[PDB]
Enzyme design. Sequence first.
Site: not given
Ligand SMILES: CC(C)(COP(=O)(O)OP(=O)(O)OC[C@H]1O[C@@H](n2cnc3c(N)ncnc32)[C@H](O)[C@@H]1OP(=O)(O)O)[C@@H](O)C(=O)NCCC(=O)NCCS
Lengths: 368, 370
Positions: A149, A201, A282, A315
């Site tokens: 990214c 993604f 990003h 994304n």
């Molecule tokens: C997917 C996403 C939008 C969910 O929204 P959030 O802000 O995490 O809000 P919540 O904490 O309530 O949700 C988390 C849930 O998803 C799981 N989870 C979230 N992120 C996780 C991760 N990296 N790995 C494993 N599990 C994950 C958690 O276990 C949790 O499960 P639950 O419902 O049983 O509690 C957020 O985790 C996200 O955007 N992750 C991407 C991180 C990123 O930006 N990476 C950069 C790549 S370019």
Amino acid sequence: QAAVLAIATANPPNIFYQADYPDFYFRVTKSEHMTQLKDKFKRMCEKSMIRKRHMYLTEDVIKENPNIGILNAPSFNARQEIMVEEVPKLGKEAALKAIKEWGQPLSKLTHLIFCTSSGVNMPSADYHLAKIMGLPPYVQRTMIYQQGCFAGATALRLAKDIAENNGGHTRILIVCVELMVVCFQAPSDTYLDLLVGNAIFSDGAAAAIVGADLDTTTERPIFNIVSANQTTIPDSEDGIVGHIREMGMKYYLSRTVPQVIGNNIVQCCRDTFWNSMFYIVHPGGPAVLRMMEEKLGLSKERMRASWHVLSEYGNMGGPSVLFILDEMRNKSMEEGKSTTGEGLEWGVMFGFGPGLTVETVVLRSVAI
Amino acid sequence: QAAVLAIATANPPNIFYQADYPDFYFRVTKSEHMTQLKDKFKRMCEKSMIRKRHMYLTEDVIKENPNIGILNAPSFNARQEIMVEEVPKLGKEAALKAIKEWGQPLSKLTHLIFCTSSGVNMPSADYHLAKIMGLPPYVQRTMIYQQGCFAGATALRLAKDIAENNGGHTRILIVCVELMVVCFQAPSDTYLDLLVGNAIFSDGAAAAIVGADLDTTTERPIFNIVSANQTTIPDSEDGIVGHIREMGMKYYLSRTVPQVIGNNIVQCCRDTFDWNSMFYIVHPGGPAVLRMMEEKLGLSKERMRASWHVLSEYGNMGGPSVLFILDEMRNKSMEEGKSTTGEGLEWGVMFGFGPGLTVETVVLRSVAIN
Ligand SMILES: CC(C)(COP(=O)(O)OP(=O)(O)OC[C@H]1O[C@@H](n2cnc3c(N)ncnc32)[C@H](O)[C@@H]1OP(=O)(O)O)[C@@H](O)C(=O)NCCC(=O)NCCS
Ligand SMILES: CC(C)(COP(=O)(O)OP(=O)(O)OC[C@H]1O[C@@H](n2cnc3c(N)ncnc32)[C@H](O)[C@@H]1OP(=O)(O)O)[C@@H](O)C(=O)NCCC(=O)NCCS
């Protein structure tokens, strides 16, 4: 000083609305019996702030390549054959519109920088794009593979020095493309990082033209690239991990990336320069964008372009920062703002990805 | 103006003498009953003008990863895990010697360009090098993956504009590495491109330091990077082809590549520049390319000496090969009392080439020595 002279984008025609994905995903992967997992995945799609995503990988493509939908099954060759063909084609669509905007002949380009993490080949996607576009044989290609990214931002960093050190004629086409064919994986109880990646993604292509010392009769800057620097966050290699395997790419997204990235780019912002500048971040997730708002105390309007690209596209990895830059200067003009940067003068673009690696680009708007 | 300030190289400890390689290659792949095919492979090796090759992939590594030696068997995962670890390790060995010769602290670098066609990962080989070398977090990384045998020259081209546009203290470490773990394949009588690559492809690492406007008291250039241009040869897409697959990389090598390349870089010389009065660094793709240079330019036999030497002692190492040649040329020029780092001559050219067909041309200028 190097400037962005045009931007344009493209996406696969099929739209997947985030509301219906948690059912589509678990259905086509014959996984409907993992109801507790699906409820968790429904929870991720809703929190993702993604309204819709464009994707090459339709249910038909999965039926034609059924191992892509079967976890751990060998599907790399199938994924590879698709991406090696389709990645340059989607890049051609966006590059054509960007060259239409630039308003100059193809024979005026000197360089091509192509970026993708969706497939690898020799000759590589940069060559294939130059073939199917019929670029002259003097166009000098740079291929940026598997940088994730921050590839769009890193292309600008490279383009600045190429454009500025070779002078007035040097003109660089940048093309960043991603197809999540590369990393789609069926859901599994032990591998909880898929549910994250499969919630966010998506596919897209963005193209841009960069040059300095402009023909002021034909060429007009949208943004100036003031500076571009990469930094690495120590002991964070476990944050974003891409393992390319016979089952395709196994990605692994640590829970701590948004806070780690968020704290760090907020720091880069201070170290480098808060509602008086424009921002392109990003859309790694919604939490990174909020942290920029929370820790810099931005108005809701400052992150609007980045929230918009996230919502309407998800994304898309590499090209996403260029979608946001195009979206920013477009609404700036339609709303009659003073500048291409929403009426402001200074701005910052952040790419980030495996490493963890941060690419910081200092931009300056153009008066409109 | 950007200059090469240091060069160093590294290779796997295991040496494979070409005289013994037909027997080895058909023995470890349990294909020695393919007697006509093996005779053809012998003839290829006997004409390769390769005396020895250094290689990571030994009989033991094949035994540990038996699918690598079984044609069409799934071995991508096995190859990947080896190369993701071993490519930055071997690059490190070269990089440290390059930094040692440079004479400045490792922390004085500002940029790293890493090139390999041997494995892909995220984060990439450039990050892994930075990690195991303890490069400071401000070192800005560029990763050049899958660009084949012109990657060494492409790194000098990008490094030129980075050093000169930023200049000052800007210092670029270039590291190029290949391990033929990536593309080793067991023999087949329907797939005779494999016989060619298995006769020529070898392992190595090279590292170079690049900077513009350096301090005369501490730093002294070995060559000046005058210019660098990439060109593509039209209608030559099928000359060099690399399909990365679950069986590893399947390459395809057209028989005409040496002539297409040879005729193209001879023309590049003429358009760009007594042909015996400049020095030459030519990627050792095979013996036919170098003989075409000598023939069509009327070169004495000293002109390609360094390129023949590397071909003989190391084989076709891909990307890093031109840096091996550049180092060999510079070293023997010093050792044999020549007047410049380019064999007593002032101007020189480096040609890398690879899939495309793509040609990378780097115009060089020696520095006075002795
Ligand atoms: C997917 C996403 C939008 C969910 O929204 P959030 O802000 O995490 O809000 P919540 O904490 O309530 O949700 C988390 C849930 O998803 C799981 N989870 C979230 N992120 C996780 C991760 N990296 N790995 C494993 N599990 C994950 C958690 O276990 C949790 O499960 P639950 O419902 O049983 O509690 C957020 O985790 C996200 O955007 N992750 C991407 C991180 C990123 O930006 N990476 C950069 C790549 S370019
Ligand atoms: C293998 C090599 C050393 C021997 O070739 P040579 O010196 O020209 O002499 P020959 O033509 O007699 O080659 C001997 C055998 O190799 C075969 N051969 C040569 N090139 C071949 C190719 N691309 N594909 C299939 N077979 C080939 C010939 O058919 C011949 O078979 P035979 O002995 O049973 O008749 C030479 O072909 C070579 O170096 N090729 C390199 C190609 C290259 O540089 N690729 C660039 C990647 S960086």
